[PDB]
């Protein structure tokens, strides 16, 4: 069960990068409208 | 209060009694996000008005 | 269509609220009337059944013939 | 324990899908930071780097040039993109004032094929030599020494041959189909005279493979007496402008003017002189023998019996063209629905003529 | 004989959009558009065809026996 946990940690932080990227975009698009 | 003219320019309010309507034929505005009825005072009174053209929920005043 | 007041730039579309719908337009779902209320028009009523009512019933019978039913 | 690898693969699918969605959102936000400009039309050319234009947001202005300005494709009248800040021309656009796709009918190539215009082949071959040949290979008349004809008049019974011959010319040649009815020019309303012909000449100037067609010329015509105007205000301005377009300094070499009416007597004799209308083609009325090929187009296209007789229904038909028999074939299948048949009874089309005779002659 | 459709575009665009909407479904019996007026002073070849308003139906004054049902 220690195999998939290596690639799961990568996809977990890659989701946070896309989350923090859109988080500033969600507040920016509402200010641009 | 008697109102023979009403206008507003670049006002951000809130959907509910937002108004922001320019009664002049130039730069016409509307109101979205549901329906509200406020026959007495919509938001501020005063520069809230209708005059010629019907716009959305502004009819009660 | 939401646009800027100063620069007049298109930003985002808006939902339909005031469409200038031209009110006082009569909308009635399946009214109640019969052709026997107004008589003497059976000559014209037959023309209304032949060119309107009957092709309105089933459009598959006229489609198998390759023709097009009149719309009015 | 190995079944959890599917959740790892489905997790990566959500990362790749959302990443493409977040990238499109950022590009849409960056598009909001762009700055648009105004739009106008050049009223007069003052110089190479200076043009007199007319803004859509205000009165006439005089602007400059910005970048990517082609002096060959940009001249007086060409629609431009006006700068609100420095008053310059940002881009180049074709000339449009009144909508050309609404008041004027424009379609790619043609619609009606050569099957519906059949029987005119003797006049069709002569029509292709004076229209199709000069638009494709102008060298045909250059070696002969004859000038190509500008206008060609197709006249006949109303609704008979006017629509069929109009869309057939654009289909065989390949040029676009321009339909400009004469009923959209002359009015009791003030104006609406020159602006239609000038912009129609501008549309055919931008797109070379085009052919202009008209209809109902008899309403805008008439010779009066001295070619003056009494209640003719919109009639005379139209008749004179049509002559100045072909014989003017700039004609349409890639576009031929076509007019549709009843009789040539309803047209201004000024337009009948050589240099404007060089060709007159008469559309006859198909008789019982002539209409035999008409019922083989629309009526024979739909589902019919193998024993169907074209000679039985033609005896009751009087002056029915390809468009007029559309109601005959429509009413023919109306009597066959009661017997539950997928074909058309030859006796039902004979009874369908009496139903069409209530409207058509 | 007037071109005033170009003068007032409310009348022209209503007719232009009418030609596009009647051609939306040519095989469907669920699209039907009719009209009624006092008389027809103008004939439009574009409106006369299969699938549009074609057949002229005249409505004269009611007959003798027809008025007995209305008064009833």
Swiss-Prot record, chain B:
Modification after translation (UniProt): The N-terminus is blocked.
Chain positions with Phosphoserine modification: 38
Location in or out of the cell: Cytoplasm; Nucleus
Domain of life: Eukaryota
Membership in a protein family: Belongs to the AAA ATPase family.
Subunit composition and interactions: Interacts with UBR1 and CIC1.
Miscellaneous comment: Present with 105 molecules/cell in log phase SD medium.
Function: The 26S proteasome is involved in the ATP-dependent degradation of ubiquitinated proteins. The regulatory (or ATPase) complex confers ATP dependency and substrate specificity to the 26S complex.
Protein name: 26S proteasome regulatory subunit 7 homolog
Source organism of this protein record: Saccharomyces cerevisiae (strain ATCC 204508 / S288c) (Baker's yeast)
Lineage: Eukaryota, Fungi, Dikarya, Ascomycota, Saccharomycotina
Residues of the full protein shown: 95 to 187 of 467
Swiss-Prot record, chain C:
Domain of life, per lineage: Eukaryota
Cellular compartment(s): Cytoplasm; Nucleus
Post-translational modification: N-acetylated by NAT1.
Modified residues (Phosphotyrosine): 35
Family: Belongs to the AAA ATPase family.
Function noted in UniProt: The 26S proteasome is involved in the ATP-dependent degradation of ubiquitinated proteins. The regulatory (or ATPase) complex confers ATP dependency and substrate specificity to the 26S complex.
Protein name listed in UniProt: 26S proteasome regulatory subunit 6A
Primary gene name: RPT5
UniProtKB/Swiss-Prot annotation, chain D:
Recorded GO CC terms: nucleus; proteasome complex; proteasome regulatory particle, base subcomplex
Source domain of life: Eukaryota
Residues holding ATP: 156-163
Post-translational modification: N-acetylated by NAT1.
GO-annotated biological processes: ERAD pathway; nucleotide-excision repair; positive regulation of RNA polymerase II transcription preinitiation complex assembly; positive regulation of transcription elongation by RNA polymerase II; proteasome regulatory particle assembly; proteasome-mediated ubiquitin-dependent protein catabolic process
MF (Gene Ontology): ATP binding; ATP hydrolysis activity; proteasome-activating activity; protein domain specific binding; ubiquitin protein ligase binding
Record key words, sorted: Acetylation, ATP-binding, Nucleotide-binding, Proteasome
Task performed by this protein: The 26S proteasome is involved in the ATP-dependent degradation of ubiquitinated proteins. The regulatory (or ATPase) complex confers ATP dependency and substrate specificity to the 26S complex.
Assigned protein family: Belongs to the AAA ATPase family.
Protein name, per record: 26S proteasome subunit RPT4
Record organism: Saccharomyces cerevisiae (strain ATCC 204508 / S288c)
Gene: RPT4
């Amino acid at each position: 069960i220690r195999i998939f946990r290596s690639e799961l940690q990568r996809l977990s932080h890659e989701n946070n990068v896309m989350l923090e990227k859109i988080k500033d975009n969600k507040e920016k698009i509402k200010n641009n409208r | 209060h008697p109102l023979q003219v009403a206008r507003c320019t670049k006002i951000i309010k809130g959907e509910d009694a937002k108004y922001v309507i320019n009664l002049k034929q130039i730069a016409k505005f509307v109101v979205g996000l549901g329906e509200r009825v406020s026959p007495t005072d919509i938001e501020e009174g005063m520069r809230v008005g209708v005059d010629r053209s019907k716009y959305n929920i502004e009819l009660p005043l | 269509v939401g646009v800027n007041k100063d620069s007049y730039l298109i930003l985002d579309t808006l939902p339909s609220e005031f469409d200038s719908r031209v009110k006082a337009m009569e909308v009635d779902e399946k009214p109640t009337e019969t052709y026997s209320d107004v008589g003497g028009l059976d000559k014209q009523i037959e023309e209304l059944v032949e060119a309107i009512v009957l092709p309105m019933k089933r459009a598959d019978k006229f489609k198998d013939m390759g023709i097009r039913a009149p719309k009015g | 324990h190995r079944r959890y690898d599917d959740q790892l693969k489905q997790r990566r699918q959500n990362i790749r899908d959302l990443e493409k969605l977040y990238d499109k959102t950022e590009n849409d936000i960056k598009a909001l930071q762009s700055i648009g400009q105004l739009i106008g039309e050049v009223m007069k050319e003052l110089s190479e780097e200076k043009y007199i234009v007319k803004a859509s947001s205000g009165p006439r202005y005089i602007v400059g040039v910005r970048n990517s300005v082609d002096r060959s494709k940009l001249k007086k009248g060409v629609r431009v993109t006006l700068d609100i800040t420095t008053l310059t021309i940002m881009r180049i656009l074709p000339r449009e004032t009144d909508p050309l796709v609404y008041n004027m009918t424009s379609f790619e190539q043609g619609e009606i094929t050569f099957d519906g215009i059949g029987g005119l082949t003797e006049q069709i071959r002569e029509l292709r030599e004076v229209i199709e040949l000069p638009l494709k290979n102008p060298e045909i008349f250059q070696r002969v020494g004859i000038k190509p004809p500008k206008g060609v008049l197709l006249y006949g019974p109303p609704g008979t041959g006017k629509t069929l011959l109009a869309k057939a010319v654009a289909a065989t040649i390949g040029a676009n189909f321009i339909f400009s009815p004469a009923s959209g020019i002359v009015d009791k309303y003030i104006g609406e005279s020159a602006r239609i012909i000038r912009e129609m000449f501008a549309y055919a100037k931008e797109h070379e493979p085009c052919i202009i067609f008209m209809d109902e010329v008899d309403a805008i015509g008439g010779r009066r007496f001295s070619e003056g105007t009494s209640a003719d205000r919109e009639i005379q301005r139209t008749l004179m402008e049509l002559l100045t377009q072909m014989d003017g300094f700039d004609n349409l070499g890639q576009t031929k003017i076509i007019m549709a009416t009843n009789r040539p007597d309803t047209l201004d004799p000024a337009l009948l002189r050589p240099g404007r209308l060089d060709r007159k083609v008469e559309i006859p009325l198909p008789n019982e023998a002539g209409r035999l090929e008409i019922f083989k187009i629309h009526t024979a296209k739909v589902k019919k019996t193998g024993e169907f007789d074209f000679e039985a229904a033609v005896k009751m038909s009087d002056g029915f063209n390809g468009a007029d028999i559309r109601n005959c074939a429509t009413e023919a299948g109306f009597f066959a629905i009661r017997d539950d048949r997928d074909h058309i009874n030859p006796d039902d089309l004979m009874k369908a003529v009496r139903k069409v005779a209530e409207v058509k002659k | 004989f007037d071109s005033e459709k170009s003068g007032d575009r409310e009348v022209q665009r209503t007719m232009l959009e009418l030609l596009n909407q009647l051609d939306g479904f040519s095989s469907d019996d669920r699209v039907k558009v009719l009209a009624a007026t006092n008389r027809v002073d103008v004939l439009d070849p574009a409106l006369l065809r299969s699938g549009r308003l074609d057949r002229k139906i005249e409505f004269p004054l009611p007959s003798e026996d027809s008025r007995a049902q209305i008064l009833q």
